[PDB]
Ligand binder design. Structure first.
Ligand code: NAG
Lengths: 157, 216
């Protein structure tokens, strides 16, 4: 169990590791939406952890990772500025930005197709009305609280 | 051609209410982000609403509730309905799309007024310079957000504002080479080599914010 909870790297948001399983913990934030299986894990910005509550709208909760209604699992998070962020700056974390519609609960998608903001085929090449859907984060240690990356490991019973 | 054409107006009493309509051509309004920017006389711009594709709605705290933003897929327009308009709510309302990373309010409507019965600062102030020399405009933020967020605007007297640079380093399309902006961290500097009021924009937070602006 511990070998899945905490490791040396984490997956980006649009491709969240649906990792399988088959005297409190020293993590400051802890909240359960059921009683006091599949464990997922990814990295999201500090202020945007709230959207991973059961049933809320936003930018990540409905376009990248969506919990179901009447949720039957807990959520965990803890600040991870030190390990992730660096003075040089890292850019290997992506989140989907332009998507046609919402996401069904516990649905994920991996794809790189240009979003057609208007009415133009674009021949698959980015242009005025065609955009790349995935845009990356930017991390640096000397940022305000909320912009720092947070590691999230949701438990779904 | 692509443009936002807006049709509304009037002078309604504190009890009353009216409807604001904005129509778009060249792109389906049910595809990209849409918002509504409000400018009051003598004050900088302010954010009022965002609609995402998929129907999620967001509102400013000052106008939390009491408004409603609805889009009509069939007619390819954008609708805003104001209910229970208070006193001292008069201002010109702008219709503008949103890209938020590749662009910041790329194309704007002509702007129509409705009449009723992270804080940024602008260091340069009302800086006046003779023609033929370079000018430096400095914008200072609070939380020291990432370098790829702030964008700069130009607004001639009584017209829709336009964007110059969206990523603080990449000029917009159809922009002369004489405009350049730089700076990372807590300060952002833009320089020229056309008199207007130049604003600082920043996304990355729920409420957004605009600078007070400077008079050239
Ligand atoms: C990972 O597992 C637990 C925290 O859940 C902790 O005891 C351990 O030190 C962590 N780090 C490593 C490198 O195992």
């Amino acid at each position: 169990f511990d070998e899945v909870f905490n490791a040396t790297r984490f997956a980006s948001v649009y491709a969240w590791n649906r990792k399988r399983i088959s005297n409190l913990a020293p993590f400051f934030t802890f909240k359960c939406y059921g009683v006091s299986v599949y464990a997922d894990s990814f990295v999201i910005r500090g202020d945007e952890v709230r959207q991973i509550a059961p049933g809320q709208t936003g930018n990540i909760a409905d376009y990248n990772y969506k919990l179901p209604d009447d949720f039957t699992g807990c959520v965990i998070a803890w600040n991870s500025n030190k390990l992730d962020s660096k003075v040089s700056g890292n850019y290997n974390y992506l989140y989907r930005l332009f998507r046609k519609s919402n996401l069904k609960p516990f649905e994920r998608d991996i794809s790189t197709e240009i979003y057609q903001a208007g009415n133009k085929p674009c021949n698959g090449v980015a242009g005025f009305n065609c955009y790349f859907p995935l845009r990356s984060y930017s991390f640096r240690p000397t940022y305000g609280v909320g912009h720092q990356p947070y590691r999230v490991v949701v438990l779904s019973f | 051609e692509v443009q936002l054409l807006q049709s509304a107006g009037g002078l309604v009493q504190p009890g009353g209410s009216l409807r604001l309509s904005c129509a778009a051509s060249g792109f389906t309004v049910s595809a990209n982000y849409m918002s509504w920017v409000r400018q009051a006389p003598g004050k900088g711009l302010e954010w009022v609403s965002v609609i995402y594709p998929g129907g999620s709605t967001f509102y400013a705290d000052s106008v939390k509730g009491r408004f409603t933003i609805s889009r009509d897929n069939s007619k390819n327009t954008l609708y805003l309905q104001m209910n229970s308009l208070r006193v001292e709510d008069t201002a010109v309302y702008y219709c503008a799309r949103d890209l938020s990373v590749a662009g910041a309010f790329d194309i704007w409507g002509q702007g129509t007024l409705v009449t009723v019965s992270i804080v940024l600062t602008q260091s340069p102030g009302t800086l006046s310079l003779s023609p033929g020399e370079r000018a430096t405009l400095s914008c200072r933020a609070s939380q020291s957000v990432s370098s790829s967020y702030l964008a700069w605007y130009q607004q001639k007297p009584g017209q829709a504002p336009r964007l110059l640079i969206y990523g603080a380093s990449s000029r917009a399309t159809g922009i002369p080479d004489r405009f350049s902006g730089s700076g990372s961290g807590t300060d952002f500097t833009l320089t020229i080599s056309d008199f207007a009021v130049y604003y600082c924009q920043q996304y990355g937070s729920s409420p957004y914010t605009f600078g007070q602006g400077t008079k050239l």
